[PDB]
Amino acid sequence: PAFRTFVASDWGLTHLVVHEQTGEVYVGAVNRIYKLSGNLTLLRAHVTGPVEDNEKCYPPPSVQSCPHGLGSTDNVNKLLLLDYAANRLLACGSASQGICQFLRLDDLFKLGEPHHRKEHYLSSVREAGSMAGVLIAGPPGQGQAKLFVGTPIDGKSEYFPTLSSRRLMANEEDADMFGFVYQDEFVSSQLKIPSDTLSKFPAFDIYYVYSFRSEQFVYYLTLQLDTQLAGEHFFTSKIVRLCVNDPKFYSYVEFPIGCEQAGVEYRLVQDAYLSRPGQALAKQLGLAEDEEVLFTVFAQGQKNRVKPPKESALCLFTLRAIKEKIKERIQSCYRGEGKLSLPWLLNKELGCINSPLQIDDDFCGQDFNQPLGGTVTIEGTPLFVDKEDGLTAVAAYDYQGRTVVFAGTRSGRIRKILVDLANPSGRPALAYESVVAQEGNPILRDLVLSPNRQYLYAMTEKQVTQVPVESCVQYTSCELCLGSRDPHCGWCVLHSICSRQDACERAEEPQRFASDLLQCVQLTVQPRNVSVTMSQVPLVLQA
Amino acid sequence: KCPALRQSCGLCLKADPRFECGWCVAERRCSLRHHCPADSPASWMHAHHGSSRCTDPKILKLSPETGPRQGGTRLTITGENLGLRFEDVRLGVHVGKVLCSPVESEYISAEQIVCEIGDASTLRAHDALVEVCVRDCSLHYRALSPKRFTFVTPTFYRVSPSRGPLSGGTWIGIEGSHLNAGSDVAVSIGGRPCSFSWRNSREIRCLTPPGHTPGSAPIVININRAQLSNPEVKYNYTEDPTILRIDPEWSINSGGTLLTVTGTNLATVREPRIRAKYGGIERENSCMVYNDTTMVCRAPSIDNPKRSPPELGERPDEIGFIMDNVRTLL
Ligand SMILES: *[C@H]1O[C@H](CO)[C@@H](O[C@@H]2O[C@H](CO)[C@@H](O[C@@H]3O[C@H](CO[C@H]4O[C@H](CO[C@H]5O[C@H](CO)[C@@H](O)[C@H](O)[C@@H]5O)[C@@H](O)[C@H](O[C@H]5O[C@H](CO)[C@@H](O)[C@H](O)[C@@H]5O)[C@@H]4O)[C@@H](O)[C@H](O[C@H]4O[C@H](CO)[C@@H](O)[C@H](O)[C@@H]4O)[C@@H]3O)[C@H](O)[C@H]2NC(C)=O)[C@H](O)[C@H]1NC(C)=O
Ligand SMILES: *[C@@H]1O[C@H](CO)[C@@H](O[C@@H]2O[C@H](CO)[C@@H](O[C@@H]3O[C@H](CO[C@H]4O[C@H](CO)[C@@H](O)[C@H](O[C@H]5O[C@H](CO)[C@@H](O)[C@H](O)[C@@H]5O)[C@@H]4O)[C@@H](O)[C@H](O[C@H]4O[C@H](CO)[C@@H](O)[C@H](O)[C@@H]4O)[C@@H]3O)[C@H](O)[C@H]2NC(C)=O)[C@H](O)[C@H]1NC(C)=O
Ligand SMILES: *[C@@H]1O[C@H](CO)[C@@H](O[C@@H]2O[C@H](CO)[C@@H](O[C@@H]3O[C@H](CO[C@H]4O[C@H](CO)[C@@H](O)[C@H](O[C@H]5O[C@H](CO)[C@@H](O)[C@H](O)[C@@H]5O)[C@@H]4O)[C@@H](O)[C@H](O[C@H]4O[C@H](CO)[C@@H](O)[C@H](O)[C@@H]4O)[C@@H]3O)[C@H](O)[C@H]2NC(C)=O)[C@H](O)[C@H]1NC(C)=O
Ligand SMILES: *[C@@H]1O[C@H](CO)[C@@H](O[C@@H]2O[C@H](CO)[C@@H](O[C@@H]3O[C@H](CO[C@H]4O[C@H](CO)[C@@H](O)[C@H](O)[C@@H]4O)[C@@H](O)[C@H](O[C@H]4O[C@H](CO)[C@@H](O)[C@H](O)[C@@H]4O)[C@@H]3O)[C@H](O)[C@H]2NC(C)=O)[C@H](O)[C@H]1NC(C)=O
Ligand SMILES: *[C@@H]1O[C@H](CO)[C@@H](O[C@@H]2O[C@H](CO)[C@@H](O[C@@H]3O[C@H](CO)[C@@H](O)[C@H](O[C@H]4O[C@H](CO)[C@@H](O)[C@H](O)[C@@H]4O)[C@@H]3O)[C@H](O)[C@H]2NC(C)=O)[C@H](O)[C@H]1NC(C)=O
């Protein structure tokens, strides 16, 4: 067999996403945004790129003249978000103080690209993937579609907010786009970098790696600078959260996050992926059906976010456990204990105000004791650690209970891990490894399973690759088939092939499909040895 | 109006995303967010983009109730609370064990599925209930048919004229069992197709095509993917009848007199009749066959208040006989 593939003809790729209805694959790149079929044939190509511009210029040349010299520069796709509700694609670029694009879903027709007002500008930052966010919607006429979006700032504190809650109007031509949900002269649905904190620590910045909506909130995994760890730059990986229904922005929380393996620290997020666990991991991790889970990838130490270490670890967080750490921390500040402790935001430490309240998971923040930080760093359950080849990306999914994990590598390889801590085994075991861009093109965080969940689109700097979740047909024998353990595989006895239950005809019947090695075909012949000179000898067969 | 037309979740999310009208679990009815209380943060459900599975699917009734064992039948299932996309119902439909493949164009979302049944030769059962699984065969998201679909193998044993003229046009009556099964029916005499009229449990009635050469011919009936044969039951094509003499060569304006007609192969037409055209009016009347050569006919009335025949006598514009498709005799 051959791996279905889309090659990047001229430039690097940045983002990928799958349409849950069609299976069309949209692909963000530098200067390009592609639409692709399920089998990775090119469907449509949008030019978004080389634009005459300059990063130093505020409002970009379109609106005002700039004295700084302009040059043909590349427009990096910073972000990509499927808006199914309005039949389109939010395709947020850079290189225009970060103006956002709207491409129509089925043909990539530019519906709109707002860039007159200051909100239509997102950030000067030219780095790919340092941005993330989520699209959330209500029905037409009600409280309209909103975008929560984090980005780096590059020290442009007064131009852009790092985190924001913005409006998504139905008309792409409408000027109201990317305007804040509630703006006041006192408090706006945004969070800015304070000027005092940039004067003290020169180039502090928040880089947003992953982001997801959960129940009623919005989480972000972030990287920040040395602020109680002027000197040198050392980063601290943290979780952020907000209530979806908090225009005031009072719900903001921020806990440091990482995990440790035999006295070795892993504190730099490279990717994450919210998922289900299915019956298997759920049960022995102690969860209800709809309880969520967060697979993550961390590098060793707190050094070089620009070029991290090989040493990397796949950890785990149950959201019930992060919810408890946040509820536990809030029911603590509402006892009046200590300070808020959030260095980069509030330079002078304001104190926790005591008050009688019913502290719930439904709590969406209040006026006093405000935006607050975290003291106890949240530790994660380790699963698999690569030491010679750094993990880069992750995904996971529920298959017939058993929880399959996918892991990109710096080499261009994907690992297919059954997590078995909650399962019978000693520790979670690798099942299989696979090749994409063998030469050493790293896999990127945007790694999405298809809608039918039959394949997994794996993106590199230079190519997209349709890697099948299940490829049991590489297994030649019942003994090797059920020996690999990667749970999709069974021996379809009468066809003498290895594949999934739904692929083996008549599998539901007795003994027609084998799932444990003990079900394998065992055969014996009574007259094992027969002479050349003999002919038509009667033999008895026990099977 | 939030539905006075839809008492099923599937029907509401089916209608415009514009209306804002959506299905509300607790009430067991459908109205806007406006008109339905939020006891749960997800108590009011709306088809976001159609990515909304809908609870408690139910089957009301399905057409063809019977089908051939060979399959190929188009099953026409009509329910109330089905899936909102095709690609979820596809793969969901089954007739007992038998895999049924649904048709895109003929599928009307959450009201009706048209499905093509596969080969049921290997099935042990004679009849099986129909099942739809909306997307996943979940315990709340499965529907089972109130009465079950029946598999048969139709057979035929007799034809009710076994003889007919080469020109064709004979009303054939094929007797058998289970003849009303499946969807399509096609009857072929000598490979050439019969014009179908009506179908029954016990009878198929069709009108014969012209035969190539006179004599015995095979009768092939195909219902969907089942092609049933019988070499013991054949159809015999006869040489076209002829008319030689009518004896009295006359009648009166109102007709009704006996006519002693003579010819050939007259027993090969079961219901022959006389035709006469007088003025702008065409009229017909009955005959009684006796031999292959003899026939008694009752003369056609030509009663016209526009023209009356003269005392001398008058030839009609046309005179002949209706004998199946032998048109030279008309
Ligand atoms: C298949 O069946 C049909 C009948 O169903 C049959 O046709 C008739 O066959 C019978 C014999 O089976 C024939 O009848 C015999 O006629 C003999 C005398 O013939 C003269 O009389 C005829 C009858 O007169 C009646 O009809 C006329 C006109 O409608 C009417 O005015 C009268 O009132 C009367 O009711 C008459 O038609 C016939 O004229 C014929 O001949 C002329 C000239 O050649 C010709 O131009 C005409 O076209 C016409 O064909 C003639 O004037 C008679 O002797 C005989 O009686 C014997 O038999 C009976 C019964 O078995 C005995 O009881 C008796 O003792 C006698 O021995 C009988 O009545 C009749 O001729 C046939 N009709 C025609 C039109 O040909 C076929 O033959 C059958 N096929 C078979 C047998 O294989
Ligand atoms: C070639 O192919 C033949 C297939 O027929 C293979 O022959 C079989 O070999 C194995 C051992 O290699 C035999 O199993 C052993 O069985 C004995 C009991 O033997 C008695 O019962 C037999 C069956 O009921 C019967 O055939 C024997 O009769 C033979 O001998 C007489 C006298 O010489 C002769 O006239 C006949 O014609 C027969 O040939 C006999 O009555 C049993 O005692 C063995 O167990 C011992 O060994 C084990 C292991 O070390 C040990 O754990 C035990 O404690 C015990 O000490 C053993 O089970 C089998 O019976 C043979 N089959 C036949 C039909 O004879 C042969 O192996 C192939 N050759 C090669 C080189 O691979
Ligand atoms: C399909 O349909 C055709 C047409 O209807 C059938 O052929 C017919 O068979 C019937 C049987 O009921 C025949 O009637 C019998 O005729 C025989 C003697 O046949 C001879 O005489 C015929 C009439 O004079 C004549 O037409 C025949 O000649 C034909 O064949 C040659 C050679 O192939 C051809 O060249 C000619 O052009 C003709 O077509 C033939 O020489 C006779 O034995 C029967 O008499 C019985 O009945 C009478 C009266 O009751 C009685 O007195 C006797 O004692 C005896 O018991 C009977 O009259 C009819 O002739 C055939 N017609 C035609 C047009 O061919 C054919 O059989 C059908 N197929 C099948 C598989 O059934
Ligand atoms: C002829 O006269 C007609 C009608 O009088 C004018 O049409 C109006 O055009 C104005 C634009 O000036 C439209 O005003 C817009 O209304 C939006 C309000 O929608 C909200 O309404 C309620 C209450 O606020 C909410 O509950 C609900 O959720 C809706 O969200 C505003 O959101 C718009 O404001 C935005 O644009 C302005 C201007 O750019 C900014 O200052 C704001 O910051 C913001 O971004 C906007 O004000 C109005 O809808 C039209 N009227 C009607 C009745 O529909 C024509 O302008 C005029 N034509 C000519 C040629 O003179
Ligand atoms: C885009 O992707 C789609 C799927 O996402 C894909 O189209 C599919 O191709 C497969 C085969 O690769 C087809 O599946 C077939 O289904 C029919 C029944 O209708 C079977 O007869 C086929 O069996 C044959 O192939 C078997 C395996 O090779 C053989 O063992 C056997 O002998 C048969 O020859 C087979 O299962 C299917 O038709 C479509 N899928 C759908 C949903 O229609 C395609 O590869 C991509 N297309 C493009 C244009 O890029």
Numbering used by the authors:
A (entry chain A): 37 to 265, 271 to 584
B (entry chain A): 806 to 1135
Copy text from the publication.
Class A plexins (PlxnAs) act as semaphorin receptors and control diverse aspects of nervous system development and plasticity, ranging from axon guidance and neuron migration to synaptic organization. All our PlxnA ectodomain structures show autoinhibitory, intermolecular “head-to-stalk” (domain 1 to domain 4-5) interactions, which are confirmed by biophysical assays, live cell fluorescence microscopy, and cell-based and neuronal growth cone collapse assays.
We determined crystal structures of the full extracellular segments of mouse PlxnA1, PlxnA2, and PlxnA4 from eight crystal forms providing a total of 13 independent structures that range in maximum resolution from 4 to 10 Å. The 4 Å dataset was obtained by dehydrating crystals of PlxnA11-10 that diffracted otherwise at best to 6 Å resolution (see Experimental Procedures). In the crystal structure of PlxnA1-full ectodomain, the sema domain (domain 1, “head”) together with domains 2–9 (“stalk”) lie in a 230 Å long curve that forms a ring-like conformation. All consecutive domains are arranged in a beads-on-a-string-like fashion, with short interdomain linkers (up to two residues) and extensive interfaces (buried surface area ranging from 716 to 1,172 Å2), each interdomain interface having a small hydrophobic core. This relative compaction can, most likely, be attributed to the dehydration procedure applied to generate this crystal form. The membrane proximal domain IPT6 (domain 10) is positioned perpendicular to the ring formed by domains 1 to 9, and the IPT6 C terminus points away from the plane of the ring. All our PlxnA full ectodomain crystal structures have an intermolecular plexin–plexin interface in common. This interface is formed by blades 1–3 of the sema domain of one plexin molecule and the outer side of domains 4-5 (PSI2-IPT2) from the ring of a second plexin. In the 4 Å PlxnA11-10 structure, the interface has a buried surface area of 1,303 Å2 (355 Å2 between sema–PSI2 and 1,008 Å2 between sema–IPT2) and a complementary electrostatic charge distribution.
